[PDB]
Amino acid sequence: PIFLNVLEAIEPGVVCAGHDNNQPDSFAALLSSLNELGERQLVHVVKWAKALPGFRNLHVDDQMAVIQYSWMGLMVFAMGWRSFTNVNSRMLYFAPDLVFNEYRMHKSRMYSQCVRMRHLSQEFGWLQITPQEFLCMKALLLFSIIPVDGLKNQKFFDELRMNYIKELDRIIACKRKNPTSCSRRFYQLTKLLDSVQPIARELHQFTFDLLIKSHMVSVDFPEMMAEIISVQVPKILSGKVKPIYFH
Ligand SMILES: C[C@](O)(COc1ccc(Cl)c(F)c1)C(=O)Nc1ccc(C#N)c(C(F)(F)F)c1
Structure with a gap:
């Protein structure tokens, strides 16, 4: 089980947001913590991605583009899984120090998105998703969104995506x-x-609007995030970069 040994071996550990839970909830603080958390997870998503089998085959520019485009979805998927395993989908487990109940979902102004992610969380249970199916499905997600104009090395990308689908087949056939x-x-x-894509799209749209008026709501956007949101997210929302759906 070489492939699964690798996926388990590189799976990021716990990442905290650094949120102050002794402070009454507020939009500004919840969002700054979400921004900070997102940025912290990105550090790990990059390390994870680069250690993924075959990833280095991609052109350097494609590696970075694919990580930045997939960033949101990857976090959504792992968060739903953490929510399922840790709190049985009772709440959204963004991080040990950033757990959302309905009140927080409502106060973050991201209620519809949060509810959709809670349903996803329940899906892991209803469908009895195994830790191995989860790990492989997550790696696949990283190769599920590309630019219409194509990547620098589209052929390498297609081969890699195909091999990951093949691994999912094997995990499914096993037994x-x-x-x-x-x-x-x-x-x-x-x-x-x-189902992950439409959720990431609503979060992308929400964050984009928020960035544009960030100075109007007192939200602190980290360096890398602001750059990515203003350069990459617009490509997705405008349709230049699209997710690869199966259905
Ligand atoms: C609004 C925000 O702080 C920033 O989200 C963005 C992240 C990446 C991009 Cl490309 C973006 F446009 C927004 C956020 O959604 N953060 C966030 C942090 C951690 C997790 C987790 N786990 C999540 C998620 F995916 F669950 F929604 C979201």
Whole structure:
């Protein structure tokens, strides 16, 4: 199980937001903590991504672009999983020190998105997603959004994405001699992975609007995040960069 050994081995550990939970909730503080948390997780997403099998094959510019585009979705997916395993989807486990109840979902002004992620969290349970299916599905997510104009080395990207799909097939076939059983599972999983995109889109849109009026709501946007939101996110919202759906 070389491939899964690698995925387990590089899976980021716990990342805290540094939020002050002794302070009454507020939009400004919850959002600054979400911004800071997002940035902290990005540090790990980059280290994770670069240690992924075959990733280094991608052109240097493609590696960075793909990480930045996939950044939101990857966080959404892992957060839903953490929410499921830690609190049985009762709340959204953004981080040990940043857990959202409905009140916080409402106060963050990201209520519709949070509810959608809570449903995703429940999906992990309802579909009985295994830790290994999760790990492989997450790696696949990193290769699920590309520019219409194409990457520097599109062929390398396609090969890599195809190999990751092949690994998902193997994890699914492992202990399923019934083809019909494998097919239904692949259907369920690709359906779950597609559901992540629309959620990341609503968060992208929300964050973009927020950045534009950040000075009007007292939100502190970190350096790297502001740059990525103003350079990369606009490409997604305008349709120049699109997610790869299965269905
Ligand atoms: C608003 C924000 O602070 C920043 O989100 C962005 C992150 C990346 C990009 Cl490309 C963006 F446009 C916004 C945020 O959503 N942070 C955030 C931090 C951690 C997690 C986790 N886990 C999440 C997520 F994915 F659950 F929604 C979100």
